[PDB]
Amino acid sequence: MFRLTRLSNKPILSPIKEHEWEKEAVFNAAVIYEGNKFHLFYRASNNKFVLNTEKPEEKYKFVSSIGYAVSEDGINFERFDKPVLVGEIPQEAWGVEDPRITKIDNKYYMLYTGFGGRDWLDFRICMVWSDDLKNWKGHRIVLDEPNKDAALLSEKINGKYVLFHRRMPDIWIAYSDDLVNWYNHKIIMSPKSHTWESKKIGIAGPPIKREDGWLLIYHGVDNNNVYRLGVALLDLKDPSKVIARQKEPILEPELDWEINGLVPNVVFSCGAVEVNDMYYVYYGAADTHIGVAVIEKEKVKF
Amino acid sequence: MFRLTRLSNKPILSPIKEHEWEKEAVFNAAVIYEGNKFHLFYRASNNKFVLNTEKPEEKYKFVSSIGYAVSEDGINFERFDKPVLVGEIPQEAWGVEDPRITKIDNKYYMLYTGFGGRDWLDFRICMVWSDDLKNWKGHRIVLDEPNKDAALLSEKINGKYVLFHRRMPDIWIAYSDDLVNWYNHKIIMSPKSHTWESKKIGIAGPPIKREDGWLLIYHGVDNNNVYRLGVALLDLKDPSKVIARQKEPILEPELDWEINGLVPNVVFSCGAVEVNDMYYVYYGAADTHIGVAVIEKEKVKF
Amino acid sequence: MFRLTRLSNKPILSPIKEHEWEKEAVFNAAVIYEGNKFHLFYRASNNKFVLNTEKPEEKYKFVSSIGYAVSEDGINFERFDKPVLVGEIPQEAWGVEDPRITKIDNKYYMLYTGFGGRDWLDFRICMVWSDDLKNWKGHRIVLDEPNKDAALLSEKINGKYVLFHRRMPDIWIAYSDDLVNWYNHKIIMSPKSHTWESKKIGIAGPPIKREDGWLLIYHGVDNNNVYRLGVALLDLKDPSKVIARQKEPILEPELDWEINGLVPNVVFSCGAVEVNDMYYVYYGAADTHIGVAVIEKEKVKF
Amino acid sequence: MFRLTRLSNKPILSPIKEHEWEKEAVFNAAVIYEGNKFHLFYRASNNKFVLNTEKPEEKYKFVSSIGYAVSEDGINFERFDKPVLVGEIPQEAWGVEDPRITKIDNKYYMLYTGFGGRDWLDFRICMVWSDDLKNWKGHRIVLDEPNKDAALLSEKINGKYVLFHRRMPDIWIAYSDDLVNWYNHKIIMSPKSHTWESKKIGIAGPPIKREDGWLLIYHGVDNNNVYRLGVALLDLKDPSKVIARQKEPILEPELDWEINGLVPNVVFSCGAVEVNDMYYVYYGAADTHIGVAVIEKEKVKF
């Protein structure tokens, strides 16, 4: 059984009170390693999260934005004054959440949750893409249904694009010829009763290719709404088949800024990259800050 | 083994965005061949099908109606801008679905699913009848239980009306003296685990009378919710006894508009008629379009 | 993966119309092999089972009794005029169900479900004992809570009696010093989502001692209320730990008297016994008849 | 490591079957030492505890009351005919549970769990107060949320009242100016996976002031729902900081009347006082009786 090791006992990205769009939270960040640089696309909130009302109410409205940060060493980031993606469309009125970025061939796809705020189910997986991590376009609703925790596989399987998603409460897979229409939906992984991952599970970042299969980091929620990270291995040629799944989590809330925050007891990753024979796992903590934790690639054994 | 053969590589009926009632889907259609015309009674939806919520949600409400279309060659159909049947009671709040029409004693009986939208089990087999295929009367809930995939046999057995239905996950038969009270319910056919028909099965159109028995076209659902068509044969004098059943399907999603659509990976028939020594099988495709495949009845061998 | 083989394609015990206490059903039987004889203690009902009313209705009352039958060969049984256990009104007003018999030392313990009919939760685990399988005494409510699927282990563990029971929906274990007060309650096994055993599980007959552990046959229920038998292996010294569990069922409704009957789609065992290196598993079929199925002990591999 | 020592091998308080309100259980008692007398405010139940129903069922309704008992030696208590507090019908329909009493500036604050019985989360922290331990008044709901295991600190911190509570599964602190509105909610202590305190923790009695900090006895719950007592030390000037915490429990079910009872395997304290340089820790045993255990003040070492 292996676990992640935090690189720092302090957050590496925190909210910035002077910036409305990221005044209260930065968290759940996609990550791409390119040109010897860590590219973080982090969710940002202008407000705490009141979630216990019948419907989303203007008086408690929060807006998610996606900011960008970049780092050479993985620890110190250059940040920017404005977000790089905002919800401009009515179905994205309360913003854009939890991006996952996958490079397929020479294009980058960011899958995120657009939240329209018209009711608590007013969310959907959206996609934008770029060829430069800078000019995002091609917006589309990936599945026209309440769904989230979505990521593209970094390559095609038998000539088809592969989508991981999350019809409650399982991790699902789907296939597409054209990145518009999805078919061959299949459950690939389910929660487990009387465990830390009993309530629901969802993919973390997009799966990382290995020789022995696809490394699928995921998040699991217990009955107290504690979010932890677990890890599984998908079959290399049929990523719809799980060939190994670790029983214990690889990361759990332990530090004060993972236990305490806007949403207690959360570690949540939307991205991880392989660098120098190590896996770098960036994670939102308490839906308030971003941490980073690593595992030596050699220790990943099931 | 035998299989149906599509007549067209493109739909024969498709939605009409200009008509609210059939804006998004036309599928799962009853057919009766009278007066050397194909009379098609098709399900039509005003909206897409969000099915993954905990309950049916008003924000994602779809309403099914039954539309009428007529053809001389079974391929080209004339259509009309208003439907022939819509929901008239609260049990049909979300419309009327998947009609199966049977003629018994010069009365036409249409059995369909009334969906109230109050929860995902809020559906009922309902029945209307008419002298003329035009003026439907006598709406009634057939069984007061969550049930569907219903069809009447075109003849009485020992003076009794014969009903096929689908208490999950099997095809049931039941008997009635009066079309009101059903009794001697029993299971006549079951799914086969670890096959394309592992999850559930349901009758397709009403069985077609043959000299060697009743042709029972049915749909089977696999573990990933793929809907395909299969074929069984019922004893001629006792339609509760399955005397043959083909191992392999006779129709499965192959064309892109059967694989892709509002509900991927679906072929589904509510209707089939014998015409010029051929069986014409009309099917919904991806719950979005209607197609039609055939087999020469000489080729139906078990 | 291994499977039970039916000794007969016909029931070995069936209702006897001229005996009111068993005129409609005989099923779910305890069994004990002693004196080189199969002693069968079967549940019997005087009526069909209306189970879908808001409360148990007098006009649909069924009463369960325990009948006795004896066999030399495991297949051909001698039966008797009167039941050997009935309910003492009112806590068992609708009778005594699903006995599991365990021999501990030189006493025989029958654990059964007492059903009072006052509401659909009005059932509890009850126990009687005898030293001769004939004079049952010492009646008690084992757990004063709605619970069932109970059996005693045939030996003490570290001095303690060992109870299997079923707080919905898991197989539980517990311990006692006096066969009256139970403690150290623990879940030992759980249903598995998206499987034949997804809704709930419960112990079948009491576990059978092996060299490699305790054989725990159980029943699992899918989302369509189909009951199938499965099998697990408990640790020999600590039978609260499951050390193996076959994924596939070992017995499923297949024959027509197992698929159709008073309750469709049911095979259910309350008893199994080892005779000449063969496990004989008695099972109720559709809550209506009793079958028997066997497995060579050699073929029990996990 | 240090541990409590039971004063006696028998309960210091038991139910009285002839008194409906305390017929089945006396347990989880608040305690205050005043006038050289132990004042014990005990939870009492008219009924056993069926807890395994999907919802609270009126057929298994239990009603908790608060009784008063008084002692000079802390062992032999005088009791009274009638409870001192009952649940007001219907907001506290199933009674008033687990009181903790804190004295602040010559007033006594009793925080208890009001249980309305309408679902298993239909409970909240309620507070009454008095200046004489007799005339309780000022009832109010402390937090408008499902919450319990609540106690006030016996003095203000930087002019603020201090509230300990338990949003599942952690111990929380909060602050108030008015004993009405609480702010700056923070988790201060969490369970520990794979230990005796892995499922959840909650405060026991109100923290006891020491020279080296605030003694926080708490209960911990393992994955089989066994209840044990642990201890931590809070920073004297900032009770939100835990400066020490003992790995092993200080009390656990051991005696038969702690292991067996209405809820097996429970020791649970709502009160502890310091008398003559000794901590007297009163505890519910198996939710059925009250015991007392002690430790010399000087043996509290971390």
Ligand SMILES: O=P(O)(O)O[C@H]1O[C@H](CO)[C@@H](O)[C@H](O)[C@@H]1O
């Ligand atoms: O067996 P129980 O009492 O229903 O408890 C369990 O229920 C959840 C399902 O809703 C499980 O998935 C959780 O593990 C929970 O602990």
Ligand SMILES: O=P(O)(O)O[C@H]1O[C@H](CO)[C@@H](O)[C@H](O)[C@@H]1O
């Ligand atoms: O819906 P999910 O994936 O189970 O997680 C939701 O809550 C998480 C914890 O607050 C957040 O981290 C997520 O952003 C999301 O709002």
Ligand SMILES: O=P(O)(O)O[C@H]1O[C@H](CO)[C@@H](O)[C@H](O)[C@@H]1O
């Ligand atoms: O209820 P059934 O028979 O399992 O089929 C359901 O799904 C089919 C495919 O989506 C549809 O074609 C049906 O109309 C129905 O909604």
Ligand SMILES: O=P(O)(O)O[C@H]1O[C@H](CO)[C@@H](O)[C@H](O)[C@@H]1O
């Ligand atoms: O409550 P359980 O154990 O899931 O099973 C119930 O239904 C079984 C099948 O009808 C019956 O065989 C049992 O007798 C019982 O009534």
Ligand SMILES: O=P(O)(O)O[C@H]1O[C@H](CO)[C@@H](O)[C@H](O)[C@@H]1O
């Ligand atoms: O909710 P908590 O604090 O985990 O404790 C609950 O169970 C305890 C042990 O039975 C009881 O002692 C408590 O009264 C309560 O019902």
Ligand SMILES: [Zn+2]
């Ligand atoms: Zn700035």
Ligand SMILES: [Zn+2]
């Ligand atoms: Zn969008």
Ligand SMILES: [Zn+2]
């Ligand atoms: Zn699922």
Ligand SMILES: [Zn+2]
């Ligand atoms: Zn998720």
Ligand SMILES: [Zn+2]
């Ligand atoms: Zn664990």
Ligand SMILES: [Zn+2]
């Ligand atoms: Zn028109």
Ligand SMILES: [Zn+2]
């Ligand atoms: Zn209707």
Ligand SMILES: [Zn+2]
């Ligand atoms: Zn169907």
Ligand SMILES: [Zn+2]
């Ligand atoms: Zn007789």
Ligand SMILES: [Zn+2]
């Ligand atoms: Zn009894």
Ligand SMILES: [Zn+2]
């Ligand atoms: Zn469970």
